[PDB]
Design a binder for this molecule. Structure first.
Ligand code: NI
Ligand code: NI
Ligand code: NI
Ligand code: NI
Lengths: 264, 264
């Protein structure tokens, strides 16, 4: 395993600041693991898998059925936690915990909240949203742990005010269409860019997520899978800048290969 | 989507009884989401991702660090829940919740428990297991919900005694080597078997898990991904019977294709 050899470079690779990384990942996430605690449940705290959509302040909105085992606890027992694992398998990868208080969405805000929720679960309400109670989890504390995004600096916490005032990275929303496209039509271009960036001649590089400062890949080299941070040459300021920076990176990789051949 | 068309057949497909399915899935699982509750944490219940290994009675053994944010709660606050999602993404797939009480593993049992834990996380103790406290989660209740394995009958619960007296399916332990092999060397054979079994001419079928009564696939047909239950012609009684039954299924698929061609 040669990840240990580029540990230092990977540590230095341009990334969002932690609070913006946590704000962005939560904003882009659609499901997580809710921990609740109710009277009438033997004194056992409970876990459930829930869908949610962050509102503009980063408060998860959950559509809670009174029939949903454990998740129904939110109705009446406001204190909860929501756990979001950027990649559920990878135990070195970023895990975010939000402690907060579930607040019913007031009649006035239902339409505005229902709209916002559908802009992350397109294909809900297929029967009826009248079968559910919209709850907003107002955060009290946001904690994270990581061995991939960062190990030494891979733990931290934020107040409600720090989290709420953090900006969602405006490029991150284009992750699935950009990655989709690269991985379908340009997989060998991602491979060449990753080799140039990291100096590991990877078998393959599958693009995972993008932000204004670069993109993350899952790469394979000699049997082993590596999560790698691939920084852009400079910050992307608009959606169009992502293609420009990817092409520039590919041209720089190809230039390096040609010059090396000139020098034998 | 043509899954709705084979709903009835898929409901009837031979499967383990629910308590044996839950006992087996938990026995074969290596990580889950722990819900804990501590004093000195604002009255917020907390979630964490933990590794575990079920003991022979099906009690999850967890190696708990006093430094692990939230999971350290187990040390001192025995009442917890462990959530295991057979496939974390798929919100129709089986989700198991165990409510139980964390009990420290006595000095006497440490070696016997440490051994048992390593037989599910081979490559722990790489530094030291002296850095951790082994806790056993004694179950009080085991609950499940499913939309794949079963929807109408896709919810239930078991007592400690019902869960503990259930048998782990003895073929399930061979899931990863059998699936590995089929998916690497015999993927088109899995495809043909799935088409014969379900009458959907699937693009591909990736074998997921096996038990004494059959195997589960993730299949693709015209853009859409389907989880399908593929029952054996009869129960497998030993590891060797799995290859025999798979070959028999492939021969039956090929015979059906030939006879159809004889009849034009
Ligand atoms: Ni319960
Ligand atoms: Ni293109
Ligand atoms: Ni906390
Ligand atoms: Ni073979």
């Amino acid at each position: 395993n040669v990840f240990q050899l580029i540990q230092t470079h990977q540590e230095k690779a341009a990334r969002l600041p932690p609070v913006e990384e946590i704000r962005t990942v939560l904003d882009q996430s659609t499901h997580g693991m809710l921990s609740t605690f109710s009277q009438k449940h033997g004194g056992y705290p409970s876990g459930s898998v829930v869908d949610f959509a962050c509102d503009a302040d980063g408060s998860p909105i959950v559509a809670v059925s009174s029939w949903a085992v454990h998740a129904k606890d939110l109705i009446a027992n406001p204190k909860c936690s929501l756990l979001v694992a950027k990649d559920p398998e990878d135990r070195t990868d970023l895990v975010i915990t939000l402690h907060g208080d579930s607040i019913p969405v007031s009649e006035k805000d239902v339409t505005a909240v229902r709209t916002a929720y559908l802009a992350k679960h397109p294909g809900a309400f297929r029967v009826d949203f009248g079968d559910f109670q919209f709850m907003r989890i107002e955060p009290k504390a946001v904690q994270y742990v990581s061995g991939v995004a960062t190990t030494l600096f891979g733990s931290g916490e934020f107040s409600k005010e720090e989290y709420q005032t953090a900006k969602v990275d405006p490029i991150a929303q284009f992750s699935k269409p950009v990655a989709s496209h690269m991985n379908r039509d340009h997989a060998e271009d991602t491979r060449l860019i990753v080799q140039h960036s990291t100096s590991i001649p990877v078998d393959s590089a599958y693009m995972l997520d993008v932000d204004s400062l670069g993109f993350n890949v899952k790469a394979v080299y000699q049997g082993n899978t590596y999560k790698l941070r691939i920084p852009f040459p400079r910050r992307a300021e608009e959606r169009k800048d992502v293609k420009t920076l990817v092409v520039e990176m590919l041209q720089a990789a190809k230039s390096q290969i040609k010059e090396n051949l000139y020098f034998q």
